[PDB]
Structures are given as structure tokens and as C-alpha cells.
Design a protein around this nucleic acid. Structure first.
Lengths: 98, 99, 98
DNA sequence: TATAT
DNA sequence: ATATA
DNA sequence: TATATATATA
DNA sequence: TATATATATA
């Protein structure tokens, strides 16, 4: 019913989905102008816990608060439980957008 | 006796915003989305008309638009400025997501 | 879809549901003739792991093989994981039916 | 008065 | 040449 | 090092 | 439902 966003803003907290991985606590990073532009509708993603990065479209992104109940369960994948801690307690770690 | 400028703003408010090196610039207070990294205290997300640049500014650099329009609303050759004046009058909701 | 059984036979392996507990690896025990009769359509249940007993009706009983992958997940409740072990490895423990 | 636009 | 600092 | 478990994809 | 991957335990 309620659709997920088709646009995100730097700072937004999400779960982000990559093949092979559980839906992962993540953050939309800023895209500095004066940099090479990414493909359209792809956002720079920061994964909590692992501090890995990637570019993902809205199809793979899930607003954190709305989907927390579903995706915020403990998982033994390396960095995941640390990620859950950070999205709650330190969601601005290494964030340069503001 | 002088009317103080606001110490708090709300999403949707139209202002002139001042950044060092620029004229007071037609702008809008954007919303701060729930479930985002929280901004520095007493700083608001700003949308600059004409350029569509953004920044975070506190109230000391923010000027209610209609109150300060006759002071800051003059034409200016800085790139995007006159387009900003057009937008704040004619399309102040451009790219606004607050409501 | 497929209905669950309305009657059971001594020796049948099931998950049995009691209020407050996860669906629990269990067995249909024999009903000795020459014993006080239970209420109709209630079966003597043996719970694996805890070796507790109760009388339950078919509303609360689930064929083990059919429902194993839904209910056969690890659980921290005392006796549960031992019950999972027994229903696979020693289903006839204390079984007097045959 | 000097600098950036 | 403007209009910024 | 090599087991079993848990959870990812197909 | 079956297989492959990643993780904990022996």
C-alpha cells in the first residue's frame, strides 16, 4: 500500500539491500557537486557497522523507522549488530553532509 | 526600539539567507525529515531559490522575506539571483517536500 | 489448504501448542484402556525435552514432518532444543504404546 | 581599500 | 564595473 | 581444521 | 524446496 520513497536526501536513515546480504542499517551520504555525478537515481550509501559504501537506487532502500520492526532484528553477519547500535546511537559517524 | 528577528523557523518559511561573500539571498526553510541524522542545534536546512543550492544556517543569518523584501529584494547580477527573486514570488514551493 | 488431522494415533509425532509456549516437539501417547477416560477428542501428549505431559485436542496439534520447517527452529525456552534432538533421535523415549 | 565576480 | 569583505 | 547452524539465493 | 555462503563450535 504505502509506497517507499523514490527520492532521498543526504542524512536519511534506511535499511539498504544488496544481494547476498540481509537488509542492512545504512545512511544516505551527500553527493558533493564538483564530483563525478553518479548514475541517475542512485545514491551514495554508508553501511553502519562495516562502514562499507556503495551506490543504490530507491528500489533497494527502506526508510529506517518504518521498516525497523521488520529488518532491525539481530543477525550474526559480521558488523550487523554493530550497525544496529550505530544507527541508533551514532548515526552521524563519518557523515560529511552537515 | 527594534523588532527582533525570529529565533525559530518552521518548514516552509520564506526568508533571505545570508552567507559570507553573497548578497542576502531569496531562500526557504526546508523540513528536517524525521529519521535523518539530526542537524547541529538551532540550525535549519536552507534552500536557495535560483541556484537550488542548500546549506544549514542559524537564525542570525535568516531574514523574514516580506519584512525584509524591500531591503534585500533588489536586482543583483550574481548568478541565479534574479531567477531566485522570480521563484520566491512565483514558485516558492519548488522541490519543497515538507508539505 | 490441507486440513490438519481431526484424530491421531498413539506414536504420532507432532508439534503441540500450549498457551505461553512455542509450538513444541511432542508425541501422541497411548490411551490405556482400563484408565479413566479423558474428555472427547483430547489426546495424551508427551513433550520432548521436558518430558512434561498434557491433554490436547487436534486444534493444538501439528503433524511433525509437515510442520517441521515452520516450527522446528532453535528456541531458548528450557528443554526446547533438547526436544528437537529427541524427536529426531529418540522419539520413542518413555513411549509405552508399542 | 582590496578582492571576487 | 559592481559588490563583496 | 573441520564440524554444524543459520540464512542467503535459486 | 534445495543449495551455497558465512559464522560459531568442537
Amino acid at each position: 500500500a504505502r509506497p517507499r520513497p523514490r527520492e532521498y536526501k543526504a542524512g536519511d536513515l534506511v535499511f539498504a539491500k544488496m544481494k547476498g546480504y540481509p537488509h542492512w542499517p545504512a545512511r544516505i551520504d551527500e553527493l558533493p557537486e564538483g564530483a563525478v555525478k553518479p548514475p541517475a537515481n542512485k545514491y551514495p550509501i554508508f553501511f553502519f557497522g562495516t562502514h562499507e559504501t556503495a551506490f543504490l537506487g530507491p528500489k533497494d532502500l527502506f526508510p529506517y523507522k518504518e521498516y525497523k520492526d521488520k529488518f532491525g532484528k539481530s543477525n550474526k553477519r559480521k558488523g550487523f549488530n554493530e550497525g544496529l547500535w550505530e544507527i541508533e546511537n551514532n548515526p552521524g559517524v563519518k557523515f560529511t553532509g552537515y
